[PDB]
Amino acid sequence: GPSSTVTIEYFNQKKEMTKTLEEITRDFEKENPKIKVKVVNVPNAGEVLKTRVLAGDVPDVVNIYPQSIELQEWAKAGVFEDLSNKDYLKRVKNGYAEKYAVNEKVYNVPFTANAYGIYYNKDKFEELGLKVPETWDEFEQLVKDIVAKGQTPFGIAGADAWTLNGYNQLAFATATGGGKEANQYLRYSQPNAIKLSDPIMKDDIKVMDILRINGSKQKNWEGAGYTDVIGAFARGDVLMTPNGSWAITAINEQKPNFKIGTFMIPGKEKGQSLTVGAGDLAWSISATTKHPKEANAFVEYMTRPEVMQKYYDVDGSPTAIEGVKQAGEDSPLAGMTEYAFTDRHLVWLQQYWTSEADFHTLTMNYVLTGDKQGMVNDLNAFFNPMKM
């Protein structure tokens, strides 16, 4: 006779959360005894997804970063179901799913998002009489003060340029007034429009020069990787490191002997700090799924407060889902995520770029060399192609 059991795939890209995602899936299956959900985790998942979609083999539910060119192009080509009118989308913070809309239609549920800022050692700031900086000038002074008191302000991963993507995007964002303004200056300006003499460029150079203050970085930072800086920070060897919300689990796993805080990178004046990030646990549904009711039931389940709470309690990334109890003001990510999901939480600028690695490289190369005109030249070289 007939069987009704159906399997859907959930194509995961959050490998760090596989255990909890699998538990969730088992809870979903106990509530829905006729649905089986396969949590797919493969190496090189981004590239595998591209291969599968191109082949016409799209997973039923897909973890896809909604800032990506792939979400944009695939959503346009009809690869994903229009979620705009789903009741469960109402559980996402007002306005936030809409930041990745395509042709005014939402194709992805952003459960969580990353953010970026400065990790710092609360204990040593307290011992040294130091405060979170609220302007560019205070952040310079903070770094100098730390050096003067015989400690090392930053762990910088000179060998992993990507770690400074957020830092330089926020330097531009704060210099220009926001994310769209920063992309106006960099991306949607005229070819070769970026000039050393520009006030914007001067301000960007100021913010970047905070990372160039004499004595500001650990010895051999040039060669240091992400893991090295996570370790230096956890050991108390450096007082701060610029990075994203994704670093916390690794920091905690190093068992620091101090309380971790975070702060937003300030603007020129008080009350002008910003952060940057995008959807992380973020799902779309195939438009060609053989089992749309079950695929939607899985996505709906994860939007429930008691289900997302299971994920959040472990992962800690800010969540856009209603009803979740987020961590308090003393939690390590509090400063970084104070303004999550607001106008002060910009979507990564590369939403509207055709690549990003070369921006990482020009950023870190400036930290290395201090060659200001070279940096301007590198910025025009990277953005000019985008402007044809």
Closest to Na ion by CB, 4 vs 373, is 4
Question: What whole-number distance in Å separates Cα of residue 95 and Cα of residue 64?
Answer: 19
Q: Give, in order, the Cα–Cα distances in Å from 244 to each of 109, 124, 278, 333, 387.
A: 21, 21, 11, 10, 29
Backbone angles phi, psi at 99, to 5 degrees: -65, -10
Which CB atom, from 29 or from 198, has the smaller least distance to Na ion? 29
Report the sign of the C-alpha dihedral through residues 230, 231, 233, 237, in that order. negative
Tell me how far, at minimum, the Cβ of 25 lies from Na ion, in Å.
22
Cβ atoms of residues 145 and 217 within 8 Å: no
As a whole number of angstroms, the longest Cα–Cα distance in the chain is 80
Q: Which is nearer to Na ion, 5 or 85 (CB)?
A: 5
Count of residues in the chain: 388
CA 119, CA 74: separation in Å to the nearest integer? 36
Q: For residues 4 and 197, which CB has a smaller minimum distance to Na ion in the complex?
A: 4
Q: For residues 33 and 129, which CB has a smaller minimum distance to Na ion in the complex?
A: 33
Torsion from C-alpha of 282, 287, 293, 295, nearest 10 degrees: -30
Neighbouring residues of 329: CB distance < 8 A, sequence distance ≥ 6 = none
Cβ 289 to Na ion, closest distance in Å?
Answer: 16
- In this structure, the number of other CB atoms found within 10 A of the CB of residue 131 comes to 12
Residue 7 or 227 having the CB closest to Na ion: 7
What is the smallest separation between the CB atom of 24 and Na ion, expressed in angstroms? 26
Q: How far is the CB of 3 from Na ion (least distance, A)?
A: 5
Minimum distance from CB of 4 to Na ion (Å)? 5
Q: How many other CB atoms sit within 10 Å of the CB of residue 297?
A: 17
Binding mask 3-42 for Na ion (x = CB under 5 A): -x--------------------------------------
Give whichever of 1 and 328 is closer to Na ion, judged by the CB atom. 1
Q: What is the DSSP letter of 350?
A: G
Residue nearest to Na ion (CB): 2
CB of 2 to Na ion, least distance (A): 4
Q: Cβ of residue 1: shortest distance to Na ion, in angstroms? A: 9
How many residues form the binding site for Na ion (CB under 5 A)?
Answer: 2
What is the per-residue burial (b if ≥16 Cβ within 10 Å, else e) of 138-167?
ebbebbebbeeeebbbbbbbbbbbbbbbbb
CB of 290 to Na ion, least distance (A): 12
Residue 328 in contact with Na ion, rule: CB under 5 A: no
Residue in 209, 173, 168 with CA at minimum distance from that of residue 379: 168
* Residue nearer to Na ion on the CB measure, 36 or 360: 36
Strand, helix or coil at 241? strand
* 2 touches Na ion by CB under 5 A: yes
Q: How far is the CB of 60 from Na ion (least distance, A)?
A: 17
Integer Cα distance of 321 and 305 in angstroms: 7
Stretch that binds Na ion, among 2-10, 229-237, 319-327, 377-385 (CB under 5 A): 2-10
* Identity of the residue, 7 or 192, whose beta carbon is nearer to Na ion in the bound complex: 7
Contact 309, 315 (CB under 8 A): no
CA dist., res. 116 & res. 104, Å (int):
27
Q: Is residue 43 close enough to count as binding Na ion by CB under 5 A?
A: no
Q: Could you identify the residue written with the tokens 């969730």?
A: 24
Rounded least distance, CB 299 to Na ion, Å: 23
CB closer to Na ion, 1 vs 56: 1
Residues that bind Na ion (CB under 5 A): 2, 4
